[PDB]
C-alpha cells in the first residue's frame, strides 16, 4: 502498495481505494481502474514536469463526514492514488505525525484508516 | 505569492523558506538557489514522471524544539519548496483542515 502513511481507504464508486493522503495535491487522483472517463481534461503540474490528464465521470465517495459526489483526475503515471486538499477539506481531516508514522483523524476525533 | 495552505516558514541555512507542507512528499525539497550541492543524486518520481535531482549538502534547519541538520532535494521543476514526511516526523506535526484552509501545529497543538 500500500502507499506509505498517512493513508486512508475510502469506498469510491462502490470499491475500496487506498489513498496516500497528499496535502500537496490540489485535486484527488485515481491511478488504475478509474471507471468511465470524461472527455474533459486538465493540465497537471507535478514536482518533475507536467502533462494533460482526463477527469473521471462522477463517483460517490463515502467520507466519514458523509457521502458526496466527486470527480478524480486519472493519472496512470502517478505511483499511488492521492487524496488531495479537495477531499481533505470535505473531511475536515487532521493528520498527526507520531512515531515514524502518521495517522488520519476525523473532525470528531475518530481515527480513520 | 505564497504556496497554498497548509504552509509553514522555517529557517534553512539561516534564512526563512516558506514551504508547502506536503504529506505526499517522501523527502523535503528546495527549488531555487539552493546553495552547495552534494555530488549525490536521487531518482524522484512525481505525479507525472521521474528523473534525477541533486541532493544539497547538509543544512541547519531551525525547527520548534531546536536545530537539526538535514539535506534537501533540489528540484527546480517543482513550483514550491516542499516540507515532506521526513521533516513532518521530526516536527511531530499535526495538520488540521478547518474552514476552507489548513493549519500546521506542533505535537501539542502549538503553532510553528
Amino acid at each position: 502498495e500500500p502507499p506509505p502513511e498517512p493513508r486512508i481507504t475510502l469506498k469510491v464508486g462502490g470499491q475500496p481505494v487506498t489513498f496516500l493522503v497528499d496535502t500537496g495535491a490540489q485535486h484527488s487522483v485515481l491511478t488504475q481502474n478509474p471507471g468511465p472517463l470524461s472527455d474533459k481534461s486538465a493540465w497537471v503540474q507535478g514536482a518533475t514536469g507536467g502533462k494533460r490528464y482526463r477527469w473521471t465521470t462522477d463517483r460517490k465517495v463515502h467520507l466519514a463526514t458523509g457521502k458526496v459526489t466527486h470527480s478524480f483526475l486519472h493519472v496512470p503515471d502517478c505511483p499511488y492514488p492521492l487524496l488531495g486538499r479537495d477531499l481533505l477539506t470535505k473531511l475536515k481531516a487532521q493528520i498527526h505525525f507520531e512515531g515514524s508514522g502518521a495517522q488520519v483523524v476525523g473532525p470528531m476525533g475518530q481515527p480513520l484508516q | 505569492e505564497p504556496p497554498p495552505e497548509p504552509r509553514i516558514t522555517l529557517k534553512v541555512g539561516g534564512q526563512p523558506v516558506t514551504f508547502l507542507v506536503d504529506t505526499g512528499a517522501q523527502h523535503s525539497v528546495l527549488t531555487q538557489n539552493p546553495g552547495p550541492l552534494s555530488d549525490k543524486s536521487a531518482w524522484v518520481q512525481g505525479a507525472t514522471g521521474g528523473k534525477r535531482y541533486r541532493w544539497t549538502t547538509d543544512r541547519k534547519v531551525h525547527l520548534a524544539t531546536g536545530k537539526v541538520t538535514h539535506s534537501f532535494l533540489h528540484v527546480p521543476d517543482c513550483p514550491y519548496p516542499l516540507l515532506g514526511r521526513d521533516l513532518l516526523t521530526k516536527l511531530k506535526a499535526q495538520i488540521h483542515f478547518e474552514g476552507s484552509g489548513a493549519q500546521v501545529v506542533g505535537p501539542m497543538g502549538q503553532p510553528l
Partner: peptide, 4 residues
Amino acid sequence: XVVX
C-alpha cells in the same frame, strides 16, 4: 505535488 499536483497543481492544475
